[PDB]
């Protein structure tokens, strides 16, 4: 059982479809009997460099436990969804649940 | 802010960044063996120096 960390940035104009996206992704995960160890939705922060002629984006962090297949599906939805401009799936040694510095600063 | 103080500031920032040395090194191609030779030579001197 692999633990993953997913960070994805979405076009700010779709940012009211972010409460929406989180829902289906968490759905798929628990659908596969996975556990959302951490969800954070710090958003509307300024980019360091422009991406796609844009200067800000909505961020979402999700530390999850899941099998590979659900992870690969998620990746493809990220690839095909036009609202998401960046995404990055990483493996983690164990489950992490303590608050990220992005929200503990808040 | 005086102009001249901004000039030396800019000069100091440019010297710290090291862009000019990078450009003068990327001007022509260096074969990997030769680059490795330079690196080894620069290490054998820094050592035989620090020791001295």
């Amino acid at each position: 059982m692999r633990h993953y960390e997913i960070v994805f940035m979405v076009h700010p104009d779709q940012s009211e479809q972010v409460p929406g996206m989180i829902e289906r992704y968490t759905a798929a995960i628990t659908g596969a009997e996975g556990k959302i160890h951490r969800l954070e939705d710090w958003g509307r922060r300024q980019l360091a460099y422009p991406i796609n002629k844009l200067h800000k984006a909505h961020y979402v962090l999700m530390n999850v436990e899941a099998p590979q297949e659900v992870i690969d599906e998620l990746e493809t939805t990220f690839r095909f969804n036009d609202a998401v401009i960046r995404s990055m799936v990483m493996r983690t040694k164990h489950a992490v649940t303590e608050a990220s510095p992005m929200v503990k600063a808040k | 802010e005086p102009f001249d103080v901004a000039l030396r500031r800019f000069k100091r920032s440019c010297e710290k960044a090291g862009v000019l040395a990078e450009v003068r090194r990327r001007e022509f191609y260096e074969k990997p063996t030769t680059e490795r030779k330079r690196a080894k030579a620069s290490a054998v001197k820094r050592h035989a120096k620090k020791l001295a």
Binding site: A48, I51, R86, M88, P101 | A17
Partner: protein, 54 residues
Amino acid sequence: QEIDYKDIATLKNYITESGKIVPSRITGTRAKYQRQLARAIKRARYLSLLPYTD
């Protein structure tokens, strides 16, 4: 323990104003932590939490 790529504040202690990673011989960091630092800095630069250049 692990150096987190999201923790931007400490990462800005190891990059110059131009965004280049500082040599470990200047920051006095151990080699293992320098490697984790470089990995985290690159990871952050991908997510645009840090700039590649100035």
